[PDB]
């Protein structure tokens, strides 16, 4: 993951940017899907 | 060097590092001397052949490896061994280069005229 931090991310935060440099999600899984790697 | 070498290989690798050390081969046949002479350059072959003349008629095929590396567009004509062809073309190319140098120096500096600024010493009153 190449997530941007520091001053460019602060600029992307306080300026509400419709085009962030590295947009991303953190997807969490429910149940057994989170426990084994194959169904993940 | 994680390598084992027998006496042939030891002598020819040492001699393959210092070809330049050879003045006179003594009485070694070319078939023994075949490796160190193939990793070599034509001026050193001329040195070896003009100190060790008896090798000359043996080394001619070797010169082919040089000729197709230095005169790759060429082929021998008949009654032309590769050594004499390489020396004839080598000296012809050096003479062509020397004639071109003596042309494009004479016909570019002495023959034509180029224009540049000359010193005035006028001290003109045109700017008073």
């Amino acid at each position: 993951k190449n997530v941007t931090l520091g001053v460019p991310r602060l600029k992307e935060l306080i300026n509400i940017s419709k085009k962030p440099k590295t947009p991303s999600l953190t997807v969490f899984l429910l149940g057994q899907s989170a426990r084994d790697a194959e169904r993940a | 060097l994680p390598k084992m070498m027998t006496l042939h290989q030891q002598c020819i690798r040492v001699l393959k590092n210092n070809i330049d050390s050879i003045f006179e081969v003594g009485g070694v046949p070319y078939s023994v001397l075949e490796p160190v002479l193939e990793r070599c350059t034509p001026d050193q072959l001329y040195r070896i052949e003009e100190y060790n003349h008896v090798l000359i008629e043996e080394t001619d095929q070797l010169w082919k490896v040089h000729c197709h590396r230095d005169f790759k567009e060429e082929r021998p004509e008949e009654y032309e061994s590769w050594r004499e062809m390489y020396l004839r073309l080598q000296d012809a190319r050096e003479q062509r280069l020397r004639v071109l140098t003596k042309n494009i120096q004479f016909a570019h500096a002495n023959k034509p005229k180029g224009r540049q600024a000359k010193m005035a010493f006028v001290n003109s009153v045109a700017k008073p």
């Binding site: - | 490896v65 197709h68 590396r69 790759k72």
Partner: protein, 116 residues
Amino acid sequence: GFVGIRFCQECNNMLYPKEDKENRILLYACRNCDYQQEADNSCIYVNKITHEVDELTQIIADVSQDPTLPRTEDHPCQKCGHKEAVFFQSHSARAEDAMRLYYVCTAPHCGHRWTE
């Protein structure tokens, strides 16, 4: 396989694919002049999306004369048995996924290029 440009002869322009339904076959026709020609290969256009696995055919033998290239004597030439060979990685944009080494024989008049 790839398809190349087939050229007209009357005006030396480009031939475009077309069909005839009377003969019901494929022909390359010139549409600057009125030239037509029956097409040899049925393949009109081909993608090569994952057909970049080869890089040996773009290598030339002249890189044996490059003094900045690494030389090895542990990879003898298969075609002529010369002990020395230059090796280098691929210089393409397809080389981001591979640090694969290619070898070129440094003996003149041979120019044999291989891989590993």
